Design a protein around this ligand. Sequence first.
Ligand SMILES: Nc1ncnc2c1ncn2[C@@H]1O[C@H](COP(=O)(O)OP(=O)(O)O)[C@@H](O)[C@H]1O
Ligand SMILES: Nc1ncnc2c1ncn2[C@@H]1O[C@H](COP(=O)(O)OP(=O)(O)O)[C@@H](O)[C@H]1O
Ligand SMILES: [Mg+2]
Ligand SMILES: [Mg+2]
Lengths: 283, 283
Amino acid sequence: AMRQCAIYGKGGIGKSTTTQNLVAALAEMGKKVMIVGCDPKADSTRLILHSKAQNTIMEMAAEAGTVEDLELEDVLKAGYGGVKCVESGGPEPGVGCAGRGVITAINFLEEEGAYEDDLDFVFYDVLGDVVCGGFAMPIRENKAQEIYIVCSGEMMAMYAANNISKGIVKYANSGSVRLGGLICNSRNTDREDELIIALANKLGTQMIHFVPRDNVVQRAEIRRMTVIEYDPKAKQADEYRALARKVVDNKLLVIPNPITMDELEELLMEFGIMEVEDESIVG
Amino acid sequence: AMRQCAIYGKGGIGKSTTTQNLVAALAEMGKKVMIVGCDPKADSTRLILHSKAQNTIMEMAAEAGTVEDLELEDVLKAGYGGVKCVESGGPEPGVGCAGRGVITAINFLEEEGAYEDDLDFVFYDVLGDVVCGGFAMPIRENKAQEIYIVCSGEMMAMYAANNISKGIVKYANSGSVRLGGLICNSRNTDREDELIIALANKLGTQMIHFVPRDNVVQRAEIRRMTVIEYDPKAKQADEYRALARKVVDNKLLVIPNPITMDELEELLMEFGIMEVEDESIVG
Ligand SMILES: Nc1ncnc2c1ncn2[C@@H]1O[C@H](COP(=O)(O)OP(=O)(O)O)[C@@H](O)[C@H]1O
Ligand SMILES: Nc1ncnc2c1ncn2[C@@H]1O[C@H](COP(=O)(O)OP(=O)(O)O)[C@@H](O)[C@H]1O
Ligand SMILES: [Mg+2]
Ligand SMILES: [Mg+2]
């Protein structure tokens, strides 16, 4: 068996940091994992590969001739813990559709047998600011059964979580795409954990983990590593191991109940997030 | 004469707060302004209209029959300082193209003569996480001559600024779309002003204003107002008046020089943004 998972969320919310660290923790447990980068930023695999980034399927297809010309053994790259890595890429700004590379990449990986019987997990790291074109494809075409949304007490982050949830509902008449959980990537603000638990409950899911804000992430990433590899003893390494454990153990996969903007505003005001003057722990 | 301006930037960076406050300051000066919301979040006019939000052209066209059926006098709404307001709207998550409403809205406003000879400014408030479909239309179809990008020391915010700049370059062989400036929306971090000045210089533009992080924004917005209307004496009201003055006075409109991710990473490391442990002013 293999579990096809996607990590969605607004830009800069922590999808790639959270995904690569979660996947490093899964590899540390003995899981076989593939990361498929589905964000035009195309740095979703750099911490596994110890690299600047990774050349994209779009770039490699352009050099080879066509995508069907590429070899999977030439495309996939293995890094920390034997984690397999691939980047979709996408057109330059202002051209066609920012998500078109995701469609090409997932279809190529499926056609060429990348989904080996011994993989335990695939994680798609997907841009979530718009739910359309190739960014919607993992939901619309039933590629990722378990959606985990990285979010925070930020209105935009919660709005994005709600829109991804609407996408899941839209396509629920076929396939098996479900919301698996919210991951709160901390803004170091009072009652943020309570806020995302409350949002999860309104959507019908759970807050699968509260990831603290820890500057060790900046120190590991300057060195192109996951915290798991950079400092296995770090407090934050144990946080990603806890998230990985709860993902492995998770059995709650729902058709979510999207909320109104009235409900989103009520949550923010209920937990006093917009009335906070300073961080929970200054420094 | 009228100046067609667009405010771009990543989600949650401060486009709508900055645009509505800038435009309130322009109205306070005696300028005639229209805001065109080009973000599916569709809350780009609520602080001018004292409102929850505004019904969108897509919503109103669906109720009327077709868009060509709508009357401009029924669509535009005036709020604080006589500022005229309209929202594009867009399809539900998972459908067609998130930006399609922007195309319909701008074409309708142009056809129906919304661009009255007495308007001094139009501001499009445009989603900037992807530069494609209707989100690219204001650049591709020469609708906004002056692009101002709201950004911060956040890598994602600078990446977005660079991608919007690539879009401007892509379409520079026709029309007159130019980069007018970066607006730094402060994260209360050391040397962030210096970082965005340095980014502006590499792109060939300027940092037109450094907008401080001020919790008075949360207090005004809870009451559905700009800071300009909520508290005309506020320190932050004078910040938006300074931005408005520099926009009125700006004559630097360039074809930008997009940078590499290497250059973006070099900027972050040069100004020590990722090595900071606490905010510049705690609290
Ligand atoms: N838990 C965390 N603590 C500290 N910094 C974090 C944490 N999670 C993410 N970051 C930082 O936040 C920024 C954005 O994270 P990233 O995963 O690249 O976002 P996305 O992939 O959603 O655009 C990066 O600078 C990253 O190092
Ligand atoms: N200068 C500022 N100081 C304090 N809060 C701000 C400031 N600018 C924006 N905000 C807040 O940041 C959030 C996002 O701003 P918004 O303009 O809605 O972003 P966007 O339109 O780019 O998605 C809102 O909660 C807004 O009140
Ligand atoms: Mg990423
Ligand atoms: Mg907005």
